[PDB]
Amino acid sequence: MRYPSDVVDQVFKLPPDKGLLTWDNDPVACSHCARPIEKGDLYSPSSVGAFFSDTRNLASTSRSICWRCLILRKKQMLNGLSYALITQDGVFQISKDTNKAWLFTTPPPAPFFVMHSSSTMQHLCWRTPVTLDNRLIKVRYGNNLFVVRPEAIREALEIADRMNEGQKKWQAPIFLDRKAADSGHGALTKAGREHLSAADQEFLLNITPGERWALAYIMHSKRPQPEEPECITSKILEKL
DNA sequence: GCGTCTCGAATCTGATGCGTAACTTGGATGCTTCGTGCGT
Ligand SMILES: [Zn+2]
Numbered sequence: 001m002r003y004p005s006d007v008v009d010q011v012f013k014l015p016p017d018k019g020l021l022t023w024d025n026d027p028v029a030c031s032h033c034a035r036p037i038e039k040g041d042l043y044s045p046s047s048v049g050a051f052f053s054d055t056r057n058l059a060s061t062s063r064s065i066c067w068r069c070l071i072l073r074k075k076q077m078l079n080g081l082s083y084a085l086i087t088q089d090g091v092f093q094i095s096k097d098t099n100k101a102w103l104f105t106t107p108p109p110a111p112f113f114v115m116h117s118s119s120t121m122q123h124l125c126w127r128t129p130v131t132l133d134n135r136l137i138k139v140r141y142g143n144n145l146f147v148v149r150p151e152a153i154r155e156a157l158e159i160a161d162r163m164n165e166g167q168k169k170w171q172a173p174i175f176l177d178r179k180a181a182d183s184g185h186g187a188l189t190k191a192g193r194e195h196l197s198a199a200d201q202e203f204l205l206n207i208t209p210g211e212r213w214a215l216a217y218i219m220h221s222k223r224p225q226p227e228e229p230e231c232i233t234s235k236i237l238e239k240l
Numbered sequence: 241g242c243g244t245c246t247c248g249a250a251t252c253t254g255a256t257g258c259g260t261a262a263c264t265t266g267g268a269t270g271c272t273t274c275g276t277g278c279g280t
């Protein structure tokens with residue numbers, strides 16, 4: 001895939017809705033997924049309504065929405081893709097911690113989109129940049145766009161295991177929060193501050209926010225075993 | 241019209257108890273769409 005809207009016609013294969021206008025002016029980017037809207041394509045003027053609180057993430061002021069985004073803005077699409085991973089084969093659910101560990105330790109090779117919501121249901125279909133290479137995974141968490149490097153996650157897990165190797169009571173070296181909301185998120189704990197070497201402390205302080213978020217779901221006393229997430233595109237298509 | 245001597249001294253100089261108790265020891269929110277109907 002190339003664009004967030006490309007997930008529709010490639011893994012959902014949903015035909016465009018009826019009654020959509022046809023573009024007849026100089027091409028302009030979509031207001032959601034930044035896809036160009038060329039002459040002869042199907043679009044619709046923006047009618048997001050007063051309850052749309054994602055104006056800051058709009059690609060442009062074209063006020064035009066391509067049919068793929070019009071599909072992606074349906075309630076069944078927003079709810080189904082709350083904790084989704086959209087790859088070529090299908091849409092997978094990464095809600096469970098084991099799924100997150102598998103994704104951030106053994107990512108799929110193909111381009112994919114990573115979905116995650118910080119509340120009941122949020123606009124995430126059209127805000128996630130594509131992950132071209134598995135070594136640089138871009139994850140959209142609520143209003144935060146994260147960059148996760150699997151090698152950094154593996155190195156941090158190795159550091160935590162080596163620091164907790166001797167002590168019988170397991171204790172995390174770095175303070176992390178699943179919601180990425182705590183005031184101490186990403187800061188070293190007392191055990192990390194006074195039981196780790198200078199190189200390990202410098203590495204743990206110099207990780208990206210996305211890596212902290214991922215370790216908040218992976219790094220624990222009993223590391224979850226990675227497992228393949230289930231196929232979810234069937235459920236979303238049936239509910240639509 | 242003073243007048244001067246003497247113009248202190250020893251010793252005690254604190255003891256004893258009490259010298260905390262019970263209860264609170266958080267709570268709530270931070271999402272949009274969709275259908276149906278008002279409605280100004
Ligand atoms: Zn679009």
